[PDB]
Design a protein around this nucleic acid. Structure first.
Length: 134
RNA sequence: UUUUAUAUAUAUAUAAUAAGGAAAAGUAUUUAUAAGAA
């Protein structure tokens, strides 16, 4: 029913019902191939709302068992694209407490921890891309 | 482009994928001075 309500209209594809369904669903994204999934998510899922993006980030983390190292570059591109497409809720006069920038940074230290943990494991690698910076 | 996939011996060949869209009105003194003709 979710697909019929929103996705049939090509101009605006609302994936918030989809992310809500899979979050409520117990299976979540587990036992799904990382790679075909990551490319599909990046390709099709965009212009999500914030609460949907938080659920997406958490569900990808749980799918990949919390291994920050495994969290692929496409996963970053998808989350960062969704966060960038968001407009500010309001232009705060100071303009430093925005939720989006905080989550964006949080993913950045997650990438740094991924590199550090892989190197300490020594004792593919994810890449930061120009799309994320943009 | 970028990233990734399959295959092959860190690298190579093919396939897919592209983040750059912002709207608004009003806010003079100029300078020195070179002419040719039969």
């Amino acid at each position: 029913d979710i697909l019929a309500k929103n996705l049939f209209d090509r101009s605006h594809s609302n994936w918030a019902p989809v992310i809500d369904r899979l979050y409520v669903s117990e299976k979540r994204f587990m036992d799904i191939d990382s790679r075909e999934f990551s490319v599909w998510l990046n390709g099709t899922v965009k212009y999500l709302p914030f609460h949907s993006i938080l659920h997406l980030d958490e569900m990808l983390l749980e799918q990949i068992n919390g291994d920050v190292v495994k969290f692929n570059t496409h996963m970053y591109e998808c989350i960062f694209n969704n966060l960038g497409n968001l407009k500010p809720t309001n232009f705060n006069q100071d303009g430093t407490n925005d939720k989006v920038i905080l989550k964006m940074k949080e993913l950045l230290e997650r990438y740094d921890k991924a590199l550090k943990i892989t190197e300490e494991r020594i004792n593919k690698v994810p890449k930061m891309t120009q799309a994320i910076l943009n």
